[PDB]
Amino acid sequence: GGTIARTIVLQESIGKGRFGEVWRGKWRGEEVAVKIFSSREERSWFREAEIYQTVMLRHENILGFIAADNKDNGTWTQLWLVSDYHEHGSLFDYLNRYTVTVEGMIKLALSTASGLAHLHMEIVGTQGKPAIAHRDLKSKNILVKKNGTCCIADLGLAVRHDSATDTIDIAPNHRVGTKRYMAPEVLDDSINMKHFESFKRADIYAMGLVFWEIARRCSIGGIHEDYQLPYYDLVPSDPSVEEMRKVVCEQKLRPNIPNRWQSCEALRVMAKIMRECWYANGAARLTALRIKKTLSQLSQQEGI
């Protein structure tokens, strides 16, 4: 028999994502995460397996993929994805549970930007990597490792670019992803989904929102903000496209940047990155690579 799902024992239910359910399991004595899909979710399982098996994808700031597998329990077939397990769980959970130091904030923001720059970057060569856009980046889809750096997960809605043709490997539907984090051009459906660069730019808007969630929890002299999701002050829980579009597109509002973030070079640089992710025009936003460079220079100056 097989060497993966056959030998893994599920221990603890973690919860349901877009499709399937995540568990903590044990494999050769080691904790692993397992995402289990049913037979009628095969397209979702296959596509996420396909993205994670992309040549040259592995990176410290992308969730470490172990395998795709099947497991037949005697009644039905389960479709498995197996990954590294991170005890802290999501950035969303971590930021709810904890405050961070200036060092902690920069590590979380730099590691996220590094993972997104790696996803976005085409690597040339025989073992080349296509450019990839995420399409559902949010704090619930980022994990915090024991070393206090992040890695990006839920690659199931990702799209891959063929640079030679400027074409994408699937036919994208409109307004996939989490409505709270949707870029203005996604909410008003103006995005040109035939241009791969548009999907990169939409990811940058979402990463800006995630940076705002992190910076709220950066405690200096015991001062910090409470955990909130972006737009907690303007839209209902589980907002509709229309509710988001009225706020982000029509009223042109973004998450508030507290006066406190001007007091501190690290928070000033973070706030400036947020503003330069939040432009209505995607073409004006920072690249992940530029954000990585800026936070790398800030990491150096603060001695992390």
Ligand X SMILES: Cc1cccc(-c2[nH]c(CNc3ccccc3F)nc2-c2ccc3ncnn3c2)n1
14 binds ligand X (CB under 6 A): yes
Closest distance between ligand X and the C-beta of residue 15, in Å?
Answer: 4
Amino acid in the structure at residue 6: R
CB nearer to ligand X: give 44 or 141: 141
154 binds ligand X (CB under 6 A): yes
Is 41 labelled as part of a ligand binding site? Answer: no
35 binds ligand X (CB under 6 A): yes
Which residue in 295, 301, 297 sits closest to 107, CA to CA? Answer: 295
Active-site annotation, residues: 136
63 binds ligand X (CB under 6 A): yes
69 binds ligand X (CB under 6 A): no
Is 16 labelled as part of a ligand binding site? Answer: yes
Instruction: Report the residue from 51, 67, 105, 153 that binds ligand X according to the rule CB under 6 A.
Output: 153
Instruction: Report the residue from 62, 81, 209, 257 that binds ligand X according to the rule CB under 6 A.
Output: 81
- Report d(CA 205, CA 184) in Å as an integer: 9
Is 46 labelled as part of a ligand binding site? Answer: no
67 binds ligand X (CB under 6 A): no
Instruction: Report the residue from 25, 45, 69, 89 that binds ligand X according to the rule CB under 6 A.
Output: 89
Return all residues near 135 (Cβ < 8 A) that are at least 6 apart: 157, 158, 159, 172, 176, 177, 199, 202, 203
Closest distance between ligand X and the C-beta of residue 213, in Å?
Answer: 14
> What tokens appear for 101 in the block?
């130091």
Closest distance between ligand X and the C-beta of residue 65, in Å?
Answer: 6
- Report d(CA 238, CA 244) in Å as an integer: 10
303: left (phi over 0), alpha (psi -120 to 50) or beta: left
Is 22 labelled as part of a ligand binding site? Answer: yes
Closest distance between ligand X and the C-beta of residue 111, in Å?
Answer: 15
CB nearer to ligand X: give 49 or 264: 49
User: CA separation (Å) from 232 to 51, 81, 215, 228, 296?
Assistant: 32, 33, 15, 6, 30
Which residue in 216, 185, 215 sits closest to 203, CA to CA? Answer: 185
Closest distance between ligand X and the C-beta of residue 54, in Å?
Answer: 13
User: CA separation (Å) from 304 to 95, 147, 299?
Assistant: 20, 12, 6
Instruction: Report the residue from 2, 7, 13, 15 that binds ligand X according to the rule CB under 6 A.
Output: 15
85 binds ligand X (CB under 6 A): yes
Q: Where are the alpha helices (DSSP H) in 38-166?
A: 42-52, 91-97, 102-120
Site of interaction with ligand X (CB under 6 A): 14-17, 22, 33-35, 48, 52, 63, 65, 81, 83, 85-86, 89-90, 140-141, 143, 153-154
Binding site for ATP, by residue number, is: 14-22, 35
